[PDB]
Ligand binder design. Sequence first.
Ligand SMILES: [Co+2]
Length: 257
Amino acid sequence: HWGYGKHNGPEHWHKDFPIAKGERQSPVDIDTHTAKYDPSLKPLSVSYDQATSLRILNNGHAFNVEFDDSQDKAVLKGGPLDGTYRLIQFHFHWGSLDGQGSEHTVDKKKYAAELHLVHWNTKYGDFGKAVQQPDGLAVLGIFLKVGSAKPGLQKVVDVLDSIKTKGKSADFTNFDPRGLLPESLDYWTYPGSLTTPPLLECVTWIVLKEPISVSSEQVLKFRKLNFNGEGEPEELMVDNWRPAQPLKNRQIKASFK
Ligand SMILES: [Co+2]
């Protein structure tokens, strides 16, 4: 199947997923000088007080922290969004080195990692129906730089030894995703896609301007995960990022001046 190797990486995905060469693919480079302030944007509302985390899963490409999305417990609203978007999972993309790992770039700068909080539009009833719609998903993207530790990340890092290999999961209840957010909610937004196959063009991206800081030790633990299953040759889960795709006929909007 697809992955991040030389033989199955991003440059190959179009053969099975022709939408890889589509009109609204993600990620993109955010050219900060050409993004324009949009006065029509509403304020961003992140309402995560009632979030119910359930489980963490190594799916062979990243690890997902999964949430109960059968009620409006953890929702994103406002900004560019019309309606209510429920948190289903978050995951990260990261590098083998601190100078790469993010999917979005900012003036061509790569961060060490990128957090994606994935939400689906409740008007479509379930995730699987939402991904078939142009406004089905809202993904909040947050850059990670290496510096000080992120305290709210540590409970994630410490369970990673229990989900080393593909297909492993662990209970992961009572995790508060608020502890992964930066101080400011200023953002850029644009219409795009999933960044993994099937690369569906269903995402309103909301990328925060302010990165969070994580420690060397925290990112090093991400890099100890495995793409392989237990009892298969070890292949470290690193460099699980798609590079920037052509912007084509899109404008990136800023929530701030
Ligand atoms: Co992602």
